[PDB]
Write a protein that binds this DNA or RNA. Structure first.
Ligand SMILES: [Mn+2]
Length: 745
DNA sequence: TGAGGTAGTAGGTTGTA
DNA sequence: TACAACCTACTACCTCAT
């Protein structure tokens, strides 16, 4: 079979315990403690003397070689204390920082094509290689004709163990930069407005974006208080203001919004964050070229890391520190335990389905009792194309026929819909202001003959006249009428095309079409392990000071959605209170008693982004009600990636394979073939439980495979994934009361 | 938004070592 | 205390075959 590994290179040799220098910082300046400026004074001292290292442990600063004791620094003066050999087995993070520093210092001295150093390094974990590595193993600069440049931000993070071995964890991440500035684009007259720009001089954190431009030169005193070049002289930045010439004295001021105030900077400073928005809108053939190189299978970034640690080579400063260029054989050598989870059995109306497409051909497992009466919004210029699209979706859902022709791959009466084209409601709406969208949605929903909305919206692209998607979704979720929507690209795909590449669109339309009205398309025949329900939670933190409240959901040992419940009382901060948990678990016991007449004997509580506190509430609250319970936290977005070795030639891993260490389980849930990227796996953590992670991850993978609004599987499990969707869609959900119909799908 | 995945890029907290 | 993981938002392609 195909085993799995992880982006790790074992350092050949051993890190020996070396002679360091204990430094202490004296509280000279206005700062009371030396803790909050130990990073600041750290990189100041590092900037002092030929870029020599300095490391941070809570009170003792370590340097490897004897720096001369300087006290000329204005806020802080430091003091040498003693010099001794520090033990590696007590100092893990310190010698890890030593190894990352020395591989930085060895990669600085490497040049490619003679003049050009390969890696621009600021002595951190981010090693930006100026020179790419391509598909055909050519380490070549790839620049655009328009000034764009791809680079690949290596992320080292080596850790050392108690014996002395250092393991270099890596992460390829192709980043985006340009040699141009916004002044150079002003020289060819490119429009600077609408540009997410990044100050490489001021390292403030904020979405800096261009405000405007008037005609004042930079050699004139402005609203900052003076001529800004004098403040560049004032900010200990003479080496960057000494350079620019008399034509650059004719630079025109371009101001920038750093999300709290205006900033008046020179345009020779500011460089645009050239996102894929920018690469597409300004040179799209460059984007079509580079998606072979930023969407990247395991073979390609393994080739890159092979080149990377081939370029590191060996370091004699750490006693023959060399790195292997091959991955591991298995993660058992690293500490985890691999394995593959078998696929879940899925059933529909007449029992088992072979694959996730057969449910249209045989029938759905859980239909809601009643009839689903459609109603369609569409653009007024796009009448007949929408007519053919709605005729296609209704013929598919009711009559089992596709563009009139009946076909054996689709069962009849798949959803009990009631849609008569001579009798039902069509409302053409013109693409205009958003209040026209509001009056169109209420002019549909005033008539109580509709149970489901199919709006035809414009595409997610197409900046001119914009989406009617989000105000429609807000109104149809607030009016308690679920809606599945169509971008008009898909409408002419239904009308004009004559092949199955509108039928696949139609498959995901029908799965969403039954998910929105509370039906469940398929379930498991059995969820592994003794279990009666699932509980998924999440909290959201989009910006600073914003804590989205909790959202709960319940499933069963079939995994059908019984209920998703929003708690009523608002929380306090990131970590939630106890009354929210009280009402959530009282209501989840009420809902499971409502749907099965008994209490749960097992409960697997899935969880997104909580800490291990509040667990005593779970302990006493389920000791009073004496159900054995399980709490498993699902970690959504990890920088950790996953590989798969086929006889030394390594590629993407198949879906359903996990790697596990105790309570730490990484698992890839999705299948991605090559030239499309590499699958970004999950991370699974158990805070309290009596179950092994085998049946836990089997539940995890089965609830990846029961996404109820698409033919292909979701990456997240649908407990924490659907709770995460509701925590995204916090204003779509009705507040405080129970519901079955999935709005977000 | 068909629909999910990848990827980027910006931006914040705070948990476990 | 730090700080590496964790979150979050938005686009761009790309393929879906029973
Ligand atoms: Mn949808």
């Amino acid at each position: 079979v195909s085993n799995l590994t992880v982006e790790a290179f074992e350092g050949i040799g051993s890190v020996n315990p070396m002679l360091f220098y204990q430094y202490k910082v004296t509280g000279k300046g206005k700062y009371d403690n030396v803790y909050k400026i130990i990073k600041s004074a750290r990189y100041k001292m590092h900037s002092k003397n030929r870029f020599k290292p300095v490391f941070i442990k809570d009170d003792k600063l370590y340097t490897l070689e004897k720096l001369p004791d300087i006290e000329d620094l204005d806020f802080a003066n430091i003091n040498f204390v003693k010099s001794e050999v520090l033990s590696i087995e007590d100092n893990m993070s310190i010698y890890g920082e030593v190894v990352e520093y020395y591989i930085n210092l060895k990669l600085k001295k490497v040049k490619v094509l003679g003049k050009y150093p390969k890696y621009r390094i600021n002595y951190s974990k981010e090693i930006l290689s100026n020179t790419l590595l391509t598909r055909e193993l050519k380490d070549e600069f790839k620049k655009s004709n328009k000034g764009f440049n791809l680079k690949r931000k290596f992320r080292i993070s080596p850790v050392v163990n108690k014996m002395g071995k250092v393991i270099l964890y890596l992460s390829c991440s192709a980043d985006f930069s340009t040699n141009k500035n916004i002044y150079e684009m002003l020289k060819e007259g490119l429009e600077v407005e609408g540009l997410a720009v990044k100050s490489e001089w001021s390292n403030i954190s904020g979405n800096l974006v261009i405000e405007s431009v008037l005609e004042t030169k930079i050699s004139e005193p402005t609203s900052l208080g003076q001529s800004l070049i004098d403040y560049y002289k004032n900010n200990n930045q003479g080496y960057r203001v000494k350079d620019f010439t008399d034509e650059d004295l004719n630079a025109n001021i371009v101001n920038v919004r750093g999300n709290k105030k205006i900033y008046m900077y020179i345009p020779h400073a500011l460089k645009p964050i050239i996102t894929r928005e920018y690469l597409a809108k300004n040179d799209p053939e460059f984007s079509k070229e580079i998606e072979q190189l930023i969407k990247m299978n395991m073979n390609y970034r393994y080739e890159t890391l092979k080149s990377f640690v081939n370029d590191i080579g060996v370091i004699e400063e750490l006693n023959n520190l060399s790195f292997k260029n091959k991955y591991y054989e298995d993660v058992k050598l690293l500490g985890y335990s691999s394995g593959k989870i078998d696929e879940p059995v899925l059933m529909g109306a007449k029992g088992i389905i072979k694959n996730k497409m057969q449910i249209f051909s045989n029938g759905f497992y859980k239909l809601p009792e009643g009839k689903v009466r459609f109603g369609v919004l569409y653009p007024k210029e796009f009448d007949g194309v929408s007519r053919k699209a709605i005729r296609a979706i209704y013929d598919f859902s009711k009559e089992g026929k596709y563009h009139g022709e009946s076909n054996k791959y689709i069962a009849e009466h798949l959803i009990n819909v009631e849609f008569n084209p001579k009798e039902c409601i069509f409302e053409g709406y013109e693409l205009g202001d958003i209040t026209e969208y509001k009056k169109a949605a209420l002019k549909l929903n005033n008539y109580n003959n509709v149970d489901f909305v199919i709006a035809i919206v414009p595409n997610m692209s197409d900046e001119e006249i914009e989406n009617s998607y989000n105000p429609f979704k807000k109104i149809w979720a607030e009016l308690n009428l679920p809606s599945q929507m169509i971008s008009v690209k898909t409408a002419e795909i239904f009308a004009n095309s004559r092949d199955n590449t509108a039928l696949y669109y139609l498959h995901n339309i029908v799965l969403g079409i039954l998910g929105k009205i509370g039906g469940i398309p398929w379930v498991v025949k059995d969820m592994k392990g003794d279990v009666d329900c699932f509980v998924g939670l999440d909290v959201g933190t989009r910006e600073k000071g914003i804590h989205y409240p909790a959202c709960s959901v319940v499933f069963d040992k079939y995994g059908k959605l019984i209920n998703y419940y929003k708690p009523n009382i608002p929380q306090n901060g990131e970590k939630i209170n106890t009354e929210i948990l009280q009402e959530i678990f009282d209501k989840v016991l009420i809902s499971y008693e409502e749907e099965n007449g008994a209490y749960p004997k097992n409960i697997v509580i899935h969880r997104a982004g909580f800490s291990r506190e509040d667990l005593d509430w779970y302990e006493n609250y389920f000791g009073k009600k004496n159900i054995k319970f399980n709490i498993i936290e699902v970690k959504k977005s990890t920088p950790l990636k996953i590989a798969s070795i086929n006889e030394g030639n390594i590629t993407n891993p198949e879906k359903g394979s996990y790697i596990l260490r105790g309570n730490k389980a990484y698992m890839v849930t999705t299948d991605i073939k090559e030239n499309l990227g590499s699958p970004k796996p999950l991370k699974i953590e158990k805070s309290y439980g009596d179950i092994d992670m085998l049946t836990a991850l089997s539940q995890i993978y089965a609830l990846t495979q029961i996404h109820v609004g698409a033919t292909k599987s979701l990456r997240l499990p649908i407990t924490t994934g659907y709770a995460d969707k509701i925590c995204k869609a916090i204003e779509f959900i009705p507040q405080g009361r129970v519901d079955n119909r999935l709005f977000f799908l």
